[PDB]
């Protein structure tokens, strides 16, 4: 099943649906697609963190939010340019400005 316990984003992306209980996910560019079924089961997960500033500097596919639903923050200077793009403008229901 599982021996683990750092559902986080290094060198692989398979290890996210397995640890119930993080409620924030923070994420960097370029690193993987975020294909189907990463978050499956996620009994609390409510907020996602882009590091990146550019919408194609990450791929999701069609399958990014499986078995999940949250929110998407991404930096202010990021945001239009996600509202303009050919596909993160169908995440834009979700998609909102940082703090700090």
Not at 32 to 55: H, R
Not at 76 to 94: G, H, N, S, V
């Amino acid at each position: 099943g599982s021996h683990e316990g750092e559902p986080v984003v290094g060198m692989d992306k398979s290890l996210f649906a397995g640890n119930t209980v993080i409620r924030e996910i923070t994420v960097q560019p370029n690193i993987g697609l975020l294909y189907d079924g990463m978050f499956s089961g996620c009994t609390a997960l409510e907020k996602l963190i882009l590091t990146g500033e550019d919408p194609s500097a990450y791929s999701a596919g069609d399958g990014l939010r499986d078995g999940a639903d949250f929110l998407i923050c991404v930096p202010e200077e990021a945001l239009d340019r996600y509202r303009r793009d050919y596909f993160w403008q169908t995440y834009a229901a979700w998609i909102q400005p940082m703090e700090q």
